[PDB]
Amino acid sequence: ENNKVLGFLREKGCDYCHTPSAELPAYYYIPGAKQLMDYDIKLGYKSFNLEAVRAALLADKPVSQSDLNKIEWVMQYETMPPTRYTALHWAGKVSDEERAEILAWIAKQRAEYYASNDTAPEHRNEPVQPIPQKLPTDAQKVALGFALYHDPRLSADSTISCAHCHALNAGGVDGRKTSIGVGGAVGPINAPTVFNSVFNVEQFWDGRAATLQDQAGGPPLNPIEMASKSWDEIIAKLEKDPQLKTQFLEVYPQGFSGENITDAIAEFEKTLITPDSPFDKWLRGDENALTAQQKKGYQLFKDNKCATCHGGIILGGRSFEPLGLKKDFNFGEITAADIGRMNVTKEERDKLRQKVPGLRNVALTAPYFHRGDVPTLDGAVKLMLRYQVGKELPQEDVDDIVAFLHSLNGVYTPYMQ
Ligand code: HEC
Ligand code: HEC
Ligand code: HEM
Ligand SMILES: [Ca+2]
Ligand SMILES: [Ca+2]
Ligand SMILES: [Cl-]
């Protein structure tokens, strides 16, 4: 049944536009439309990478939620292949039968791997899931991580803790365009929320850190941020604190180290989740948790492809997408921060790609985009319609999507109670 889906993808010529492609032979091309056809071949690949899906299918593994979300969408609205190629020898039209089957195969992929038991039956096939209400953690290590998160001694100055860039009462963020580090260093990119970071595939806009623990070793030693020379410098200061040291040795009787401080902080960060958004309560069957407008907004959100990228538990955070997918973005000049994932991979296709932001709590993490230059949700939604979807929408529909986004404010239970 995996093989049935693979047979279909091969049959219909999807791989011609959604894999890395040689210049095709001349008899594939429509006279008068060679350029549009080359542009379509490239945009296909930029938009959707079928080699990822083929690879997962053949190891019998889960297809990513973004890839299911994309495929569902194209099947739902009957977009693929583009209708102008379907009378060609190499590209097939897709029948109602076949569409219904793919849509069914997605639904059982989502049921096997992604849907949660506690969401209402009617909503188990959504491209999105509620935040789990609890993650298992080690309570003693959480208490350490909580103290270290808020300890300015990890910075050269002893003035900056993690909280300076990620205040837990202000959405996990500093509310600045980009963050201000030691010596007043102005940083290169907008600081994302620590809320629900645990659900990201990888951490940092470029995805250069694999886990929360690896991420936590970054800012302490980054000259642009906390700017400590070494863990030795930091520990020489933490060592003079009995209360903290005594508690620390209780866990990790090895003593202070980068490994162990980053581990403590990471464990704390697994408690920085925000379940019971009005949206999540609605996914769990409470029909009155959303307004009429927010339900419409949610429908619009799916209709305009937002859930293709912003899917899963945190409505994003799961994949790397180019800023300017469907239309070149007005960078003015492209900086190293705009280059994004390519800094990590060195791959041309990753140029300008950026971890899709989870939209959980987005109403609380202004300003927006990685540049920190988009001050409102109205703006961010419009800019995403133009550049990521290739579309305009009337005001009233934008207002509705924005209302829906306000529904994603979860509930953080403060550590101390
Ligand atoms: C202190 C120990 C912490 C912890 C636990 C975190 N931060 Fe920050 N942070 C800052 C900026 C600008 C970014 C994005 C940087 C980039 O992409 O290059 C981050 C990123 C993170 C993440 C990743 C989250 C994600 O969704 O990708 C996490 C989990 C995180 N931080 C936690 C800015 C700052 C600071 C500015 C001066 C300081 C200080 C810190 N961070 C410190 C910490
Ligand atoms: C409906 C059409 C969509 C809405 C509504 C939003 N998106 Fe996206 N999105 C994508 C990326 C790669 C980013 C980060 C961009 C950057 O580098 O500046 C975003 C960002 C947003 C944001 C801002 C969130 C924040 O700053 O933390 C919002 C509010 C947002 N998106 C809403 C990627 C994609 C994507 C990929 C192809 C699509 C189809 C969409 N986004 C669609 C929507
Ligand atoms: C059944 C075969 C195919 C499947 C399953 C498929 C799937 C997809 C998917 C998942 C997307 C991403 C969703 C999106 O960005 O809108 C997409 C977009 C795209 N595909 Fe394909 N595709 C197929 C065939 C083709 C072919 C043969 C071409 C080119 C001749 C092509 C060109 C594109 C283009 C240009 C886009 C960007 C769409 C846009 O902006 O409207 N696709 N396709
Ligand atoms: Ca055909
Ligand atoms: Ca922001
Ligand atoms: Cl995923």
Coordinates of C-alpha atoms and ligand atoms in Angstrom, one line a residue, residues 8-18 36-37 39-50 66-75 79-82 84-85 88 90-94 102 305 308 325-326 388-390, ligand 3:
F8 CA 1.2 6.5 -8.5
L9 CA 3.9 9.1 -8.0
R10 CA 6.1 7.5 -10.8
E11 CA 3.1 7.0 -13.1
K12 CA 1.9 10.6 -13.0
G13 CA 5.4 12.2 -13.7
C14 CA 5.5 14.0 -10.3
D15 CA 9.2 13.2 -10.0
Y16 CA 10.0 15.2 -13.1
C17 CA 9.3 18.4 -11.2
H18 CA 9.9 17.4 -7.6
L36 CA 7.4 28.8 -18.1
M37 CA 7.9 25.0 -18.1
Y39 CA 10.2 27.8 -14.1
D40 CA 7.5 25.3 -13.1
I41 CA 10.1 22.5 -13.0
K42 CA 12.2 24.5 -10.5
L43 CA 9.4 25.9 -8.5
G44 CA 8.0 22.4 -8.1
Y45 CA 11.2 21.2 -6.5
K46 CA 11.7 24.3 -4.4
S47 CA 8.1 23.9 -3.1
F48 CA 8.1 20.1 -2.4
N49 CA 10.9 17.6 -2.3
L50 CA 9.6 14.2 -3.3
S66 CA 4.7 19.1 6.3
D67 CA 5.0 16.7 3.4
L68 CA 1.6 15.0 4.2
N69 CA 0.1 18.5 4.7
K70 CA 1.4 19.6 1.3
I71 CA 0.3 16.5 -0.5
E72 CA -3.1 16.5 1.1
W73 CA -3.6 20.1 0.0
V74 CA -2.7 19.5 -3.7
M75 CA -5.0 16.5 -3.7
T79 CA -3.6 21.3 -8.3
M80 CA -1.2 18.5 -9.4
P81 CA 0.1 18.1 -11.9
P82 CA -0.5 21.7 -13.3
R84 CA -1.3 22.5 -18.7
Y85 CA 1.0 19.4 -18.7
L88 CA 1.7 15.3 -22.4
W90 CA 5.0 12.1 -19.4
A91 CA 2.4 13.6 -17.0
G92 CA -0.9 12.0 -16.0
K93 CA -4.1 13.5 -14.8
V94 CA -5.3 12.2 -11.4
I102 CA -4.1 9.4 -1.6
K305 CA -1.9 26.6 2.5
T308 CA 1.4 23.0 4.8
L325 CA 8.9 30.7 -2.0
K326 CA 6.3 31.8 -4.6
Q388 CA 4.7 32.1 0.6
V389 CA 1.3 31.5 -1.1
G390 CA 1.3 33.8 -4.1
Ligands
HEM3 C1 1.0 13.9 -9.1 C2 2.2 14.5 -9.3 C3 2.6 15.5 -8.5 C4 2.4 15.7 -7.1 C5 2.0 14.6 -6.2 C6 2.8 17.0 -6.8 C7 2.8 17.5 -5.6 C8 3.0 18.8 -5.3 C9 3.1 19.4 -4.0 C10 3.0 18.6 -2.7 C11 3.3 20.7 -4.1 C12 3.5 21.7 -2.9 C13 2.2 22.4 -2.6 C14 2.3 23.8 -3.2 O1 3.3 24.4 -3.1 O2 1.2 24.2 -3.7 C15 3.4 21.0 -5.5 C16 3.6 22.2 -6.0 C17 4.1 22.4 -7.3 N1 4.3 21.4 -8.3 FE1 3.8 19.6 -8.1 N2 3.2 17.6 -7.9 C18 3.1 16.8 -9.0 C19 3.3 17.0 -10.3 C20 3.9 18.2 -10.8 C21 4.5 18.4 -12.1 C22 4.6 17.3 -13.2 C23 5.0 19.7 -12.1 C24 5.6 20.5 -13.2 C25 5.3 20.2 -14.6 C26 4.7 20.2 -10.9 C27 5.0 21.5 -10.6 C28 4.7 22.1 -9.4 C29 4.8 23.5 -9.2 C30 5.3 24.5 -10.1 C31 4.5 23.7 -7.9 C32 4.4 25.0 -7.2 C33 2.9 25.1 -7.2 C34 2.3 26.5 -7.2 O3 2.8 27.6 -6.9 O4 1.1 26.6 -7.5 N3 4.1 19.3 -10.1 N4 3.2 19.8 -6.2

